[PDB]
Design a protein around this ligand. Structure first.
Ligand code: 5W5
Length: 228
């Protein structure tokens, strides 16, 4: 997260760290007792590597009573996802068992009505991604409040030049933004999951290159199918 602040410990009990070989790789969001939603590019070339999900965390390295590392039974990338595209960039991870729920571990309600979030809505994005241009990695969860950017402005030649489909949304990236390592994390608006940070490489904190988030409402039937 660039231009953000340290999050209040355990105030976002749905927040997951998706780890590969014991290191934070991507953000994720607990959407059901046994399922974490993240981004499909997260597990590219991860083939053989150990994927785990850390729930109930604030610090990645310090002991906390609510912290629990879960193994993953199945990793389900969206079938239409591809390495060279930003489309259908979703991944569902089935945990080894249902998560132990409590004040610090709880699934987030997610948007099932396919209607756009109004431009200007203030949404929250959290993650353990880089915090500066040198690549400094925070030990604790960071967050930033970002206003939603209308799709037509996001699609201008100066911005993302027509790449923003109806299944994607944008948020302003003016010195405050999601960055490397925040991919897969949640974009929460009015206490409901609206988007998942995309995992394509992009410059951070440059107002001319808005943040791109996959709209979960646009994938409600796929999310339901996988869990079933
Ligand atoms: C919104 O995303 C952007 O704007 C963005 C801007 C540049 C490169 C990339 C991105 C977004 N893509 C990712 O993050 N991806 C792609 C899938 C894997 C994941 C990644 O690379 N994980 C990672 C790797 C090393 C260290 C690390 O940990 C920490 F982050 F702590 F360093 C995390």
């Amino acid at each position: 997260i660039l231009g953000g602040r340290e999050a209040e410990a355990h105030a976002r009990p749905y927040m997951a760290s998706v780890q590969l070989n014991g290191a934070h790789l991507c953000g994720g969001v607990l959407v059901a007792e046994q399922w974490v939603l993240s981004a499909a590019h997260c597990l590219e070339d991860a083939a053989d590597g150990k994927v785990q999900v850390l729930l109930g965390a604030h610090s990645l390295s310090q002991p906390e009573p609510s912290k629990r590392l879960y193994d993953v039974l199945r990793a389900v990338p969206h079938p239409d996802s591809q390495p060279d595209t930003i489309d259908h960039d979703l991944l569902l991870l089935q945990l080894s068992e249902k998560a132990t729920l409590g004040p610090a571990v709880r699934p987030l309600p997610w948007q099932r009505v396919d209607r756009d979030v109004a431009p200007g809505t203030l949404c929250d994005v959290a993650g353990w991604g880089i915090v500066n241009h040198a690549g400094r990695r925070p030990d604790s969860l960071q967050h930033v409040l970002l206003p939603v950017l209308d799709r037509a402005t996001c699609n201008r030649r100066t911005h993302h030049d027509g790449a923003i489909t109806e299944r994607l949304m944008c948020a302003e990236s003016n010195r405050r933004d999601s960055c490397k390592g925040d991919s897969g994390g949640p974009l929460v608006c009015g206490g409901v999951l609206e988007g998942v940070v995309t995992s394509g490489s992009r410059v951070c904190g440059n107002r001319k290159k808005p943040g791109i988030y996959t709209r979960v409402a646009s994938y409600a039937a796929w999310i339901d199918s996988v869990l079933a």
